[PDB]
Amino acid sequence: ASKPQPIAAANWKCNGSESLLVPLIETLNAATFDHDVQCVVAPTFLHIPMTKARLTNPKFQIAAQNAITRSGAFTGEVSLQILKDYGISWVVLGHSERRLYYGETNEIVAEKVAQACAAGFHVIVCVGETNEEREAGRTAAVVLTQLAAVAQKLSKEAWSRVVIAYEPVWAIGTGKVATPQQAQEVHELLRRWVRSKLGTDIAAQLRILYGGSVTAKNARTLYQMRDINGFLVGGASLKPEFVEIIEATK
Amino acid sequence: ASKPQPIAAANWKCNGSESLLVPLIETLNAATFDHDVQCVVAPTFLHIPMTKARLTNPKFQIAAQNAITRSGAFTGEVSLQILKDYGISWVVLGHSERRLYYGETNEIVAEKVAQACAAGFHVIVCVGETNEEREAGRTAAVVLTQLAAVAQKLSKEAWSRVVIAYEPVWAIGTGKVATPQQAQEVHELLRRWVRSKLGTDIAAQLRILYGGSVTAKNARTLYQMRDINGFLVGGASLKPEFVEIIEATK
Ligand SMILES: O=S(=O)(O)CCCSc1nc2ccccc2s1
């Protein structure tokens, strides 16, 4: 029925410096919103400590940009347990960049999401087709296969901590945002699939966010679509306009 | 010639928590090392901040366990520039776990090392052959090709900030503890290659660290080997025992 609580998530990706983030964080702290909205900021692992120490806005949660399922002999990686111990309860998993550059198959992503949910994390699970896949008319087949791989490892209860982020690969950092119709069409497909497998309530309460060239200028029109519950913001999240994007979820 | 300054590096891998690392750090801080030695601790990115704010032992430098060549749209990753801005001047690259689980090829490792050196970092370059490769009699071909790949991208002057770590992946991967003799067998060929391809000066100043199983029990015997200049320690580097391992390089 009515839309669940919206989410405005910032993916700073592999960017940042203390001198840059300090002022940015202060802007976030001074920002107020008159509607219920879950704001999220995902710094690089290296910047999580300074962010957690400085960010005070209660409507904000800190998320890691990735994580592996187990602590151990995995040089260079950061596990969910390590993040949990540090007080981080949100995490982005399966980002297109990780599926494409760092060998994250649908199954690997699913294992990550499964362990994250079991660990009590709110997970922003990313899905999305490439330009070639959309041109070949494989969009639905692709995103449903990505989502299905994850769902198969989750229990019914786990969905209360699951968030889906649809980011068409052709819309990431290209300045070519999906039209409201294009986004709505996929969000519908995703939610309808979830409903067929998990029921009315879970499908209705599920937040499905759009990501890919989202800006303060195109955010409002996108958010008004019936099946869009917020955004995963890349480039514009490291700018002051990110506050306007949040306001766009009112 | 005499051995150059030894290095005792701790690779904490994907392990750590405030409760574990604080006591260990203060234990390292309390220890006093009378000889010339470069100590290194490589915490996960998440723990680098607490380590930098707490580590005081004068013999220590803090290193990252990995890094990518550039900042940008690489969700989950940390770039060399972000680390440098944070004040981290040491980095481990090409560790077997990344070459095996995260598809880091010789070219990828070589490129990372080249940009690292260009960025002014001291780099611990990891090389090593698997059990299969060793059983096929390919130890030399494998490790030297890995080393050659990185060597081709560097200039002679860069080696002053390069460090090689030999990982007997064949031993680690089979749950075995390589003997000082098996360790030295590879260090001998590694230095022979460096001596003939890069120069007598480079070979004499180059630290070639043993990255196999090192504990307070076998550290001294390993360091006694002619071509071993220290270690890249695993599990034991997370224990107070690491103090004795460092002392074994005297
Ligand atoms: O060479 S293989 O690909 O068969 C094994 C590589 C070791 S990676 C892994 N190590 C552990 C250890 C405990 C639990 C789960 C895992 S996955």
UniProtKB/Swiss-Prot annotation, chains A, B:
Record's GO cellular component terms: cytosol; glycosome
Top-level EC class as recorded in UniProt: isomerase
Active site: 95 (electrophile), 167 (proton acceptor)
Pfam families: TIM
InterPro entries: Aldolase_TIM, TIM_sf, TrioseP_Isoase_bac/euk, Triosephosphate_isomerase, Triosephosphate_isomerase_AS
UniProt-recorded Gene Ontology molecular function terms: triose-phosphate isomerase activity
Family annotation (SUPFAM superfamilies): Triosephosphate isomerase (TIM)
Binding positions (substrate): 11, 13
Subcellular location(s) per record: Glycosome
Name of the protein in question: Triosephosphate isomerase, glycosomal
